[PDB]
């Protein structure tokens, strides 16, 4: 029954360095070792560090060493990662996790997890989303469902919010991953599906909230002269 | 001889002084050419013991 608030995190530049800070509760601290453990987008789980018990003994991992150093302040029940020099391939949310002291040695499996933050690693300006149509209006001609859409171009950090005429649409919603551009932007389409005969029935509204810069911005999806 | 037989004055005769004995010019070693270090890290300093 532990719960673990992450301090940090946000988009960051590379070449800097700074910190988090993981307050824990629901238990006593001074007496369980911490991990740190990556979880990348489309990777999977990836080991980091961890520090004793008392904090006396610390591991870090084999790609990360000249990178990460990690501390614990038992006082306030947190966990320090001072991370720097961060790269572009190091976005991930870093769960902090603690241990049970089972096994037969001063480490062994962990059991719970904090929802660590999302240190977003960059070199370029959080770009808003630009809200784009989908509706051909000519080759929509699918009778019963056709699937039309809008686009996100261009946002970052990837939080983002797709509601259809404020949700009224609720099958066949299709919120896509990001589809990157080659220089690195994301962008992504999210449609739903409508009878050809009831294209102007319903004016449909895409409404996107870009969590980074709070873009705001709605666009119409709408069967056009095209 | 005159330290040997512990006098100053000595007599006709051959003695016998010391010993003669022919001294290391140079100091060789050869060792056989294995290279790599040895794996003490994964034993002394292991987790599991
Ligand atoms: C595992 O054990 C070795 C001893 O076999 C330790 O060697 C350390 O190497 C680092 C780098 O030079 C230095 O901290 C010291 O030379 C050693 N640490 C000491 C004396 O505390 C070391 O504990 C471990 N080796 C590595 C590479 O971490």
């Known amino acids: 029954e532990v719960q673990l608030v992450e301090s940090g995190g946000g988009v960051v530049q590379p070449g800097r360095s700074l910190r988090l800070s993981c307050a824990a509760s629901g238990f006593t601290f001074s007496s369980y070792p911490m991990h740190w453990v990556r979880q990348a987008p489309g990777k999977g789980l990836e080991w980091v560090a961890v520090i004793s018990y008392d904090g006396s003994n610390k591991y870090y991992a084999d790609s990360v060493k000249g990178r990460f150093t990690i501390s614990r302040d038992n006082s306030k029940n947190t966990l320090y990662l001072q991370m720097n020099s961060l790269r572009a391939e190091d976005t991930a949310v870093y769960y902090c996790?603690?241990?049970?002291?089972?096994?037969?040695?001063?480490?062994?499996?962990?059991?719970?997890w904090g929802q660590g933050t999302l240190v977003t690693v960059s070199s370029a300006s959080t770009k808003g989303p630009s809200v784009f149509p989908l509706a051909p209006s000519s080759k929509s001609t699918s009778g019963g469902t056709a699937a039309l859409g809008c686009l996100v171009k261009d946002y970052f950090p990837e939080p983002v919010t797709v509601s259809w005429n404020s949700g009224a649409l609720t099958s066949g919603v299709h919120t896509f991953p990001a589809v990157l551009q080659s220089s690195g932007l994301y962008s992504l389409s999210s449609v739903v599906t409508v009878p050809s005969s009831s294209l102007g029935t319903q004016t449909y509204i895409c409404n996107v909230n870009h969590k980074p810069s709070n873009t705001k911005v709605d666009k119409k999806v709408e069967p056009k002269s095209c | 001889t005159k330290c040997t037989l512990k006098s100053f004055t000595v007599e006709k005769g051959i003695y016998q002084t010391s010993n003669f004995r022919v001294q290391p010019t140079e100091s060789i070693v050869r060792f056989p050419n294995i290279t790599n270090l040895c794996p003490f890290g994964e034993v002394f300093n292991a987790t599991r013991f």
């Open positions: 996790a603690r241990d049970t002291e089972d096994c037969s040695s001063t480490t062994c499996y962990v059991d719970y």
